[PDB]
Symmetry: none
Subunit: 45 residues, 6 copies
């Protein structure tokens, strides 16, 4: 449940579907800490 | 296009401890676009 | 060679090819993640 | 060599480093349906 | 049974563990993609 | 953070026919951000 780097990016692609996304705090909450699926969708477009 | 090793890594990811079965998910998620909702339907 | 988490999942995929496989949690976690199992046990998780 | 879906996404991440990137639903035209090169791919990065 | 392209490489990654491995396309490509090879044939491309 | 199977997938992609060796590439590309250039030094 730690999402960073290439793996964070794989996760975004997955949960964002058609919505798309931007990638460069999502890192604090989901890479440094464990976020949920719901927390993750909130970074799509 | 969610294909190969990445599809399986995705299943692990959305299913956690619940687990999953892997075989048509290839048709549904690799050859066509499936959603998280559709992917969740391969967990146990 | 303790296959746990994503690595366990990456492994089954390889040895089962088209056969597919099942992943759930005396238990594959016990046999392959907490301990080292061989392919024999892993093929035993295909269908 | 034909980069689509999750792999296209793996590629963008790779060539963009710190710059980051944007991914939408054309890069699909250029790099997924046909084989594209480096810079053609980078302009969908930042 | 037939390992080609990235899969051969994922397989190498898997079976070589700490040894690491070298991938160079008479060839792991001939031996494991065009024909079915075993682990030792596969292991001899680890380091 | 470029790590594990993905690190190995990255090598395969950028090295093409040259091939590559995998073992530090980890320090430079997983724990830290490497560029294509630092990565290519692991091709043949």
């Amino acid at each position: 449940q730690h999402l960073c780097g290439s793996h964070l990016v794989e996760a975004l692609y997955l949960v964002c579907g058609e919505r798309g996304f931007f990638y460069t705090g999502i890192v604090e909450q989901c890479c440094h800490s464990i976020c949920s699926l719901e927390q993750l969708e909130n970074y799509c477009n």
